RNA sequence: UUAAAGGAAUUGACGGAAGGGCACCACCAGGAGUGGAGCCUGCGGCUUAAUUUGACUCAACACGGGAAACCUCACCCGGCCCGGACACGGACAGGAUUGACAGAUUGAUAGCUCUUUCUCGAUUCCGUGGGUGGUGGUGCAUGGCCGUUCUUAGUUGGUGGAGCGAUUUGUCUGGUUAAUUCCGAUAACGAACGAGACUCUGGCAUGCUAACUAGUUACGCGACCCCCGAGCGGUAACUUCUUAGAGGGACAAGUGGCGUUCAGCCACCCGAGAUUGAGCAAUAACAGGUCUGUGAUGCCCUUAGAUGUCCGGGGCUGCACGCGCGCUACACUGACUGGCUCAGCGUGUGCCUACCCUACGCCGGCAGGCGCGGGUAACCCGUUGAACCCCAUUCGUGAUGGGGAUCGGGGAUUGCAAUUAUUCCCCAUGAACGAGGAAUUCCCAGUAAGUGCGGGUCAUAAGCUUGCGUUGAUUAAGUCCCUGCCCU
RNA sequence: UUUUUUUUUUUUUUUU
């Protein structure tokens, strides 16, 4: 049910790296849908985002099978969770235009 | 645990819809996995014409 | 079950009528004296005419044909058409 | 139609485990004011039980991570 | 070692149209969304969207639009800036029937009764260029028994082939 | 050394041969012609209805894959020049040496 | 005792009411039939624990693309797991959270549970709010989509007349047309949608486009046989047969005649072709089907012993029956053994998520087993050596050798396993059935029927479907008599 | 020449 301690802090890593993850619908029982990013199937991935959807953090956008995500400045104010784990280092998504 | 027995490695359990995730109607192998319930709705997007 | 046939169309032909398997010398004299001496001969003609079986009819008629006595006209798949010459 | 369901009482809520334990569980012994006396045996290191202890059974001896159960006739 | 015939990549980039455009309106429904342009540049993937509020496509300093680009990098497997997103202001803002339906939705949702709404865009469409317009809104309006309602301006051809363009 | 043409709307295809030749035959070249491959038709028949009511009428969809082949035997610094051509989006021009 | 009876006048509808007109979902002249039997696959009636359930005149009953062994399952009998997100209070265990060997247990190697006691970390767990899941209900609340009324020519709006108003004229007497298609008349005039026009296409050609993945001539070169420069198949020039794009032509364009001045009809000319088959469809409605297609969903029902869920067996396949569409049939026009010869659309592996056809060769009775080439494809499978049919042999009018269900013993393939369903093959059992009753369906020309193949679910898997052909008729080309529809 | 007949509660309407 619960991920290990590496699995959590690394999927918080990549979602803070890239801003957007991908998932799919299929919930673990006939088939084992992982990602090409993370090496755990789907109930871990859905358990991650059920808290992240509840507080209002990372916005969900769906397309016909595969999940997508989205981030807002309301997310980044309320991403004080993982802005805590390094110091003030914002990735090359929000930061600038050239 | 026991979350998965019964292979489904062929047969009905494999063939899925790409649009709504269902397998009642038959599903084809065309570069395209559709029901026909939602194939016809979404052929006007992908370019199939009736002539 | 009960074959309560709704239809009605009877009047069948002739009571599974018998037919001769192999010839007699009564038949053989019936053969050698007038199976040429008609004007038109099919093995189907002579089968019903003299009450002879058609596999025996094409047996007998090809034999008097084999001597060359019977003058046919042609042969195809379905039919072998004879005549008497002279 | 009119399909109202309730139980015919064959089986009841035979529970998932109530984790019954002691206050804390004490394992080590001080002798000569400082000699380490380890009472429940160490385990063959299959990269699980190099720091993991064993559960006592009648002739089974349990390994916490990967169940290398130590046994003899 | 990546070959599929034209009976496969045509339908693969057939459904790539469907997968791309109908997703983009689920996250960019906020203005009057119109649709996408998928050209071919063989070492990129040029993707230009049409919408109403381009400032609701731009973002703050270049945030929202490049973020939706990397949405496409994860699933579609078109990485590394090959996917690129630009925009088009709909200059003839009353022309594309899609956004005319779309802003009609939001005016319904906060009051602004369907009478005042449907004539409001029929006024907006017919001042802006078009000569055929018929808005069909049939639903649960003024009671349980669904009463079908219709509205029509201009000149509407209902047969022959050239309906499709 | 050859170039395969495969596309969907044939107005674009006759003009993408014409954009080839108008940009080709003023160079020192020996060019072949648009060999007509048979346009293929993957037909799809559909029940037209999710349920079992009414008359039994079928939708009947068809794609039409036009295909022509052209041929250039030459040095490739002209091929890397004709690489720089603006293109119709429903056109996939593959290369073959 | 009753809240309505009445009056004119208008729009429908109906009319066994009168005039015009049309339809093979109607008929006459026809065909093929089905209805008779056998079998298959659906529906209602029986039984069960379940025989899941939607559709009930056309406008359901080979429909759910529904050809299910397990899945598919919403049905029944049993067994694991949480998706209790979220937050409050609280054992918060002075950190002690689940998981498991093995015994035992049961369909199970369920750590299900019990015994015994190691891992594991603050996501715990307790109780309340909640949400969340539901092939639950409800298509009589819905979106979309479907057909249908409705394959027929019909439909309205604006302005101006008429009427108190409903409404009306335009939308008509006529002639005409597949047609509210057109010409004239006319309190109407200007317009629109539908019909056309359009498009795929059937059709035709060019000596336009032009082809080592399509030809073709001769030049080679070889090989055969009488050999005589000739006769059939194998290794430089044009796109005539394959292919597909621009551009051409069918308009009643000439004559005859019938025709308001007409609209037009009818014969013939030269022409491939004087209109091929479609496709998309009018405003307006049914409480017609689908909530079981859906990340389209409203409201009620369900959620820790689950109307969520996988897993394991069984059901949907049961049969005194009744109905529906089909299939092979009922024989000599034929049945059998062989010899001959020629198709057209289309199909094929490392895909946005579970995944092929097959060249040649050997083995094996037959289905099949093995190795190698080729096909992400006018290359190769493939000058798809398709069948019907045709050329000879037997049978000979016989419930037979016509007919192939049931039943016996085996031999092979796919599969998680084919039992109470597979598929294929072999021998063997050789079943009713004598051209089908009162009634009804489909069809005017490459049309009907006879005959084969490819595609869709497919691992095995076509009687159904949807396309492709091939031998290619009969009688019509008219009516309102039957059923029905259109205008007064 | 016929061509006889099929029960019931079930039908809300402003404006920009
Ligand atoms: Mg409605
Ligand atoms: Mg009337
Ligand atoms: Mg008749
Ligand atoms: Mg029949
Ligand atoms: Mg019958
Ligand atoms: Mg049922
Ligand atoms: Mg039916
Ligand atoms: Mg219903
Ligand atoms: Mg309904
Ligand atoms: Mg509806
Ligand atoms: Mg007046
Ligand atoms: Mg009137
Ligand atoms: Mg040619
Ligand atoms: Mg209409
Ligand atoms: Mg109904
Ligand atoms: Mg649902
Ligand atoms: Mg709701
Ligand atoms: Mg059933
Ligand atoms: Mg019956
Ligand atoms: Mg027999
Ligand atoms: Mg047989
Ligand atoms: Mg009938
Ligand atoms: Mg196929
Ligand atoms: Mg098929
Ligand atoms: Mg079927
Ligand atoms: Mg009377
Ligand atoms: Zn689906």
From Swiss-Prot, chain C:
GO terms for biological process: cytoplasmic translation; ribosomal small subunit biogenesis; rRNA processing; translation. The keyword Ubl conjugation does not apply. The modification N6-succinyllysine is found at residues 25, 67. Residues 1-11 have a biased composition (Basic residues). The modification N6-acetyllysine is found at residues 16, 25, 33, 39, 67. It is found in: Cytoplasm. GO terms for molecular function: RNA binding; structural constituent of ribosome. Keywords: Acetylation, Cytoplasm, Ribonucleoprotein, Ribosomal protein. GO terms for cellular component: cytoplasm; cytosol; cytosolic ribosome; cytosolic small ribosomal subunit; extracellular exosome; nucleolus; nucleoplasm; nucleus. Belongs to the eukaryotic ribosomal protein eS25 family. Component of the small ribosomal subunit. Component of the small ribosomal subunit. The ribosome is a large ribonucleoprotein complex responsible for the synthesis of proteins in the cell. This is Small ribosomal subunit protein eS25. It comes from Homo sapiens (Human). The chain holds residues 28 to 113 of 125 of the full protein.
Swiss-Prot record, chain D:
It is found in: Cytoplasm; Nucleus, Nucleolus. A zinc finger (C4-type) spans 43-66. Changing residue 29 to R: Abolished monoubiquitination by RNF25, leading to impaired ability to rescue stalled ribosomes. There is a cross-link at residues 29, 35 (Glycyl lysine isopeptide (Lys-Gly) (interchain with G-Cter in ubiquitin)). Monoubiquitinated at Lys-29 and Lys-35 by RNF25 in response to ribosome collisions (ribosome stalling): ubiquitination promotes subsequent activation of RNF14, leading to EEF1A1 ubiquitination and degradation and rescue of stalled ribosomes. Deubiquitination at Lys-35 by USP16 is required for maturation of the 40S ribosomal complex. The modification N6-acetyllysine is found at residues 26, 35. Residues 1-17 are annotated as: Disordered. Part of the 40S ribosomal subunit. Part of the small subunit (SSU) processome, composed of more than 70 proteins and the RNA chaperone small nucleolar RNA (snoRNA) U3. Component of the 40S subunit of the ribosome. Part of the small subunit (SSU) processome, first precursor of the small eukaryotic ribosomal subunit. During the assembly of the SSU processome in the nucleolus, many ribosome biogenesis factors, an RNA chaperone and ribosomal proteins associate with the nascent pre-rRNA and work in concert to generate RNA folding, modifications, rearrangements and cleavage as well as targeted degradation of pre-ribosomal RNA by the RNA exosome. This is Small ribosomal subunit protein eS31. The lineage of its organism: Eukaryota, Metazoa, Chordata, Craniata, Vertebrata.
From Swiss-Prot, chain E:
This is Small ribosomal subunit protein uS3. Belongs to the universal ribosomal protein uS3 family. The modification Asymmetric dimethylarginine is found at residues 63-64, 66. It is a peripheral membrane protein. Methylation by PRMT1 is required for import into the nucleolus and for ribosome assembly. Residues 20-91 form the KH type-2 domain. The modification Phosphoserine is found at residues 5, 34, 103. One of its GO terms (cellular component) is ribonucleoprotein complex. There is a cross-link at residue 89 (Glycyl lysine isopeptide (Lys-Gly) (interchain with G-Cter in ubiquitin)). The modification N6-acetyllysine is found at residue 61. Changing residue 148 to A: No effect on phosphorylation by PRKCD. Changing residue 131 to A: Does not affect ability to cleave DNA but abolishes binding to 8-oxoG. The keyword Lyase applies. It is found in: Cytoplasm; Nucleus; Nucleus, Nucleolus; Mitochondrion inner membrane. GO terms for biological process: apoptotic process; base-excision repair; cell division; cellular response to hydrogen peroxide; cellular response to reactive oxygen species; cellular response to tumor necrosis factor; chromosome segregation; cytoplasmic translation. The keyword Ribonucleoprotein applies. The chain holds residues 2 to 166 of 243 of the full protein. The modification N-acetylalanine is found at residue 1. It comes from the Eukaryota. Coiled coil: none annotated. It catalyses: 2'-deoxyribonucleotide-(2'-deoxyribose 5'-phosphate)-2'-deoxyribonucleotide-DNA = a 3'-end 2'-deoxyribonucleotide-(2,3-dehydro-2,3-deoxyribose 5'-phosphate)-DNA + a 5'-end 5'-phospho-2'-deoxyribonucleoside-DNA + H(+). It comes from Homo sapiens (Human). The lineage of its organism: Eukaryota, Metazoa, Chordata, Craniata, Vertebrata.
UniProtKB/Swiss-Prot annotation, chain F:
Disulfide bonds: none annotated. GO terms for biological process: cytoplasmic translation; positive regulation of signal transduction by p53 class mediator; translation. Keywords: Acetylation, Cytoplasm, Isopeptide bond, Phosphoprotein, Ribonucleoprotein, Ribosomal protein, Ubl conjugation. The modification N6-acetyllysine is found at residues 15, 56. GO terms for molecular function: MDM2/MDM4 family protein binding; RNA binding; structural constituent of ribosome; ubiquitin ligase inhibitor activity. The modification Phosphoserine is found at residue 74. It is found in: Cytoplasm. One of its GO terms (cellular component) is cytosolic ribosome. Transmembrane segments: none annotated. Polyubiquitinated by ZNF598 via 'Lys-63'-linked ubiquitin chains when a ribosome has stalled, initiating the ribosome quality control (RQC) pathway to degrade the potentially detrimental aberrant nascent polypeptide. Deubiquitinated by OTUD3 and USP21, antagonizing ZNF598 activity. Component of the small ribosomal subunit. The ribosome is a large ribonucleoprotein complex responsible for the synthesis of proteins in the cell. Component of the 40S small ribosomal subunit. Belongs to the universal ribosomal protein uS10 family. This is Small ribosomal subunit protein uS10. It comes from Homo sapiens. The lineage of its organism: Eukaryota, Metazoa, Chordata, Craniata, Vertebrata. The chain holds residues 20 to 116 of 119 of the full protein.
């Amino acid at each position: 049910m619960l991920m290990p301690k590496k699995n959590r802090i690394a999927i918080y890593e990549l979602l803070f790296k890239e801003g957007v993850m991908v998932a799919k619908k299929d919930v673990h029982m006939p088939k084992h849908p992982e990602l090409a990013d993370k090496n755990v199937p789907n109930l871990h991935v859905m358990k991650a985002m059920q808290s992240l959807k509840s507080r209002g953090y990372v916005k969900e956008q769906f397309a016909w099978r595969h999940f997508y995500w989205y981030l807002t400045n309301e997310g980044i104010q309320y991403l004080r969770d993982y802005l805590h784990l390094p110091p003030e280092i914002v990735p090359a998504t929000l930061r600038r235009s050239r | 645990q026991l979350y998965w027995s019964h292979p489904r490695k062929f047969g009905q359990g494999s063939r899925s819809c790409r649009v709504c995730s269902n397998r009642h109607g038959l599903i084809r192998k065309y570069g395209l996995n559709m029901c026909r319930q939602c194939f016809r709705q979404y052929a006007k997007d992908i370019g199939f014409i009736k002539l | 079950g009960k074959a309560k046939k709704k239809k009605w169309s009877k009047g069948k032909v002739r009571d599974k009528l018998n037919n001769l398997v192999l010839f007699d010398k009564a038949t053989y004299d019936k053969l050698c004296k007038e199976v040429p001496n008609y004007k038109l001969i099919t093995p189907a003609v002579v089968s019903e005419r003299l009450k002879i079986r058609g596999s025996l009819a094409r047996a007998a008629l090809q034999e008097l044909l084999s001597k060359g006595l019977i003058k046919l006209v042609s042969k195809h798949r379905a039919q072998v058409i004879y005549t008497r010459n002279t | 139609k009119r399909k109202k369901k309730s139980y015919t009482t064959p089986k009841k809520n035979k529970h998932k485990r109530k984790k019954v334990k002691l206050a804390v569980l004490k394992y080590y012994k001080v002798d000569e004011n400082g000699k380490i006396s380890r009472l429940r045996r160490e385990c063959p290191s299959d990269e699980c039980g190099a720091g993991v202890f064993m559960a006592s059974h009648f002739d089974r001896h349990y390994c916490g991570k990967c169940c290398l159960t130590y046994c003899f006739n | 070692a990546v070959q599929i015939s034209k009976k496969r990549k045509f339908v693969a980039d057939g459904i790539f149209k469907a997968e791309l455009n109908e997703f983009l309106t689920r996250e960019l429904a906020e203005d009057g969304y119109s649709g996408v342009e998928v050209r071919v540049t063989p070492t990129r993937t040029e993707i230009i969207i049409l919408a109403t509020r381009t400032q609701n496509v731009l973002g703050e300093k270049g945030r929202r639009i490049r973020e939706l680009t990397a949405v496409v990098q994860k699933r579609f497997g078109f990485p590394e800036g090959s996917v690129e997103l630009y925009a088009e202001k709909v200059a003839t803002r009353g022309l594309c029937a899609i956004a005319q339906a779309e802003s009609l939705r939001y005016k319904l949702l906060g009051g602004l009764a369907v009478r005042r709404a449907c004539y409001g865009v029929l006024r907006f469409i017919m001042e802006s260029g078009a000569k055929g317009c018929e808005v069909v809104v049939s639903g649960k309006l003024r009671g349980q028994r669904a009463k079908s309602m219709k509205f029509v301006d201009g000149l509407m051809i209902h047969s022959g082939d050239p309906v499709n363009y | 050394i050859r170039i395969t043409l495969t596309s969907r709307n044939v107005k674009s295809l006759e003009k993408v041969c014409a954009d080839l030749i108008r940009g080709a035959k003023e160079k020192n070249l020996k060019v072949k012609g648009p060999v007509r491959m048979p346009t293929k038709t993957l037909r799809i028949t559909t029940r037209k209805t999710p349920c079992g009511e009414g008359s039994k009428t079928w939708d009947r969809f068809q794609m039409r894959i036009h295909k022509r082949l052209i041929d250039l035997h030459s040095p490739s610094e002209i091929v890397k020049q004709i690489t720089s051509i603006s293109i119709e989006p429903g056109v996939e021009v593959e290369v073959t040496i």
